[PDB]
């Protein structure tokens, strides 16, 4: 996983009428649910990526924000005929894995 993959798959807030629409659409927009796949679980963090970059730790390092941030947790309920999600919005602890001074992995809730 790379830095821009981390951003694409785990950082967003885009306006949607409800959490289901949010999850269903964004999983596709962000190139995760393509070619018939439905990722069962995925979390989007709604903040400045700076908070997650901020700036150089040993790599493989796991680091956690101070302020818990707004995040959306997408959970797959049905895969056929098409991906269908529910979700929960959470003020949560954001734990990340570091490489090359950058967050490239979402490890925590």
């Amino acid at each position: 996983p790379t830095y821009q993959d981390f951003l694409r798959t785990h950082v967003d807030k885009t306006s949607f009428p409800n959490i289901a629409a949010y999850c269903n659409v964004m999983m596709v927009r962000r190139g995760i649910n393509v070619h018939g796949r439905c990722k069962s679980l995925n979390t989007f963090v709604h903040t400045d990526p700076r908070n997650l970059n901020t700036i150089n730790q040993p790599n493989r390092a796991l680091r956690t924000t101070q302020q818990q941030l707004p995040v959306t947790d997408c959970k797959l309920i049905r895969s056929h005929p098409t991906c269908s999600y529910t979700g929960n919005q959470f003020n949560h602890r954001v734990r990340v894995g570091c490489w090359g001074g950058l967050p490239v992995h979402l490890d925590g809730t």
Partner: protein
């Protein structure tokens, strides 16, 4: 096979000359799908022309575009002018004002069999107007999706009246509308009185408690045609589940798909669910995700799944409080049950020991599991040699999800070596959000080229 041209676009910027180009195609198309293409209301005047002149246009899917009310009035200018079968307008910023247009439409096209208008604030007043169209004798609608439409309890008399006038209805979804028990009881009576051979009924997150489960039961017992019931994200609890099982166990009930996720079920519900699992030969797929079934509950279901009448093919029990303690019971099922093809058991602290036990059952000759999901099951590198041997040995296992496990570079490398082995018939190996170094990132790329028939997802 070919059945007319299929224009299918999603999540793109549509540019005007490309739009121009695409128009000529759309005159030819059997289906048109423009999903999340940031369409605005101005594009709908074009599509309205196409609907009228194209004798072969059968599907129109425009979800997740801000057509708005103005867009739908434009779009349907052509639909008031005669052969569309499927119309999807989910999340298109429609309000109750669109429903008059859609009323007219439903009253206009006997050809229209499917309408999807979920994720729009239509509200009760709007869907009441929509029902007036559904009541027309001309309307032959088969599938209706009204999920997340801000409906309230007061919608139900109008819907019941519409249902009575819809013998062609086969599928109905009202999920994610705050209806409540009183309304859902009234809806159940309306469905039972209706002549429709209803096949699918989705009422997830509708404010249902045990108080309306007797009534839902009566639908199951009065509609032999009903194959697919979803009531997840309703707090029915063990009490409501027991009432539902009176209908599920009724000799008329031919349920195939049963969705009971996040229903506040405890291990006590697994007594009644076991009786269903061992009695109803038609039951094929069950989701019990996010219920605290615990090991004891899972163990009851497993004992039921050994009865020869158990024809269950798919069981989802992600996040059900399960541990290694239940895995011997689960392994036993894989050994003797020939019908079970799909198991999702992620978000359970099964651990290395639990999963190694499952692999014992998986290896049995009459185990027909082709897809096993084990994401976030607290497994580590120490389990991957075992999983590896499964992957090269079990020919009929084509899908395995190990996402969100700290497998480490060492564990994933073990999985890769199995994938290289030619005896391995794995088709999709799923490894989301697993932290590995760049040397694995490079090995997966190299392995995509060595064995393209094995997709490694991350």
């Amino acid at each position: 096979y070919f059945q007319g041209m299929d224009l299918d676009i999603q999540c793109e910027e549509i540019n005007p000359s490309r739009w121009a180009e695409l128009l000529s195609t759309m005159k030819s198309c059997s289906t048109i799908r423009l999903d999340d293409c940031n369409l605005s209301s101005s594009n709908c005047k074009d599509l309205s022309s196409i609907i009228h002149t194209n004798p072969s246009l059968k599907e129109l899917k425009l979800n997740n575009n801000e057509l708005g009310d103005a867009g739908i009035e434009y779009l349907c200018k052509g639909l008031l002018t005669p052969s569309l079968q499927k119309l999807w307008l989910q999340n298109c910023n429609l309000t109750s004002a669109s429903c008059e247009t859609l009323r007219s439409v439903l009253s206009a096209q006997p050809s229209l069999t499917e309408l999807h208008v979920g994720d729009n604030k239509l509200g009760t007043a709007g869907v009441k107007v929509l029902c007036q169209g559904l009541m027309n004798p001309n309307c032959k609608l088969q599938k209706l999706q009204l999920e997340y439409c801000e409906l309230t309890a007061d919608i139900v008399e109008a819907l019941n009246a519409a249902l009575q006038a819809k013998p062609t209805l086969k599928e109905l979804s009202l999920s994610n509308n705050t209806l409540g028990d009183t309304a859902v009881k009234q809806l159940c009576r309306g469905l039972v009185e209706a002549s429709c051979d209803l096949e699918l009924l989705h009422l997830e997150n509708c404010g249902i408690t045990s108080d309306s489960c007797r009534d839902i039961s009566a639908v199951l017992s009065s509609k032999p045609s009903l194959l697919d019931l979803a009531v997840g994200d309703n707090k029915i609890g063990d009490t409501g589940l027991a009432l539902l099982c009176q209908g599920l166990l009724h000799p008329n009930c031919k349920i195939q798909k049963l969705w009971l996720w996040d229903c506040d079920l405890t291990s006590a519900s697994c007594k009644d669910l076991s009786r269903v699992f061992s009695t109803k030969e038609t039951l094929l797929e069950v989701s019990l995700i996010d219920n605290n079934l615990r090991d004891s509950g899972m163990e009851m279901l497993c004992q039921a799944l050994k009865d020869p009448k158990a024809h269950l093919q798919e069981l989802w029990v992600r996040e059900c409080g399960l541990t290694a303690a239940c895995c011997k019971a689960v392994s036993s099922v894989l050994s003797v049950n020939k019908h079970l093809q799909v198991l999702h058991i992620g978000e359970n602290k099964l651990g290395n020991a639990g999963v190694e036990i499952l692999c014992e059952g998986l290896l049995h000759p009459n185990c027909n599991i082709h897809s096993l999901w084990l994401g976030n099951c607290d497994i580590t590198a120490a389990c991957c040699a075992t999983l590896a041997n499964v992957m090269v040995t079990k020919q009929n296992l084509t899908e395995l999800d190990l996402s969100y496990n700290t497998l480490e570079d060492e564990g994933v490398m073990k999985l890769c070596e199995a994938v290289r082995n030619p005896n391995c018939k794995m088709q999709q190996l799923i490894l989301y959000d697993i932290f590995w170094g760049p040397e694995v990132d490079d090995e997966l790329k190299a392995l995509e080229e060595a064995r393209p028939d094995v997709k490694i997802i991350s």
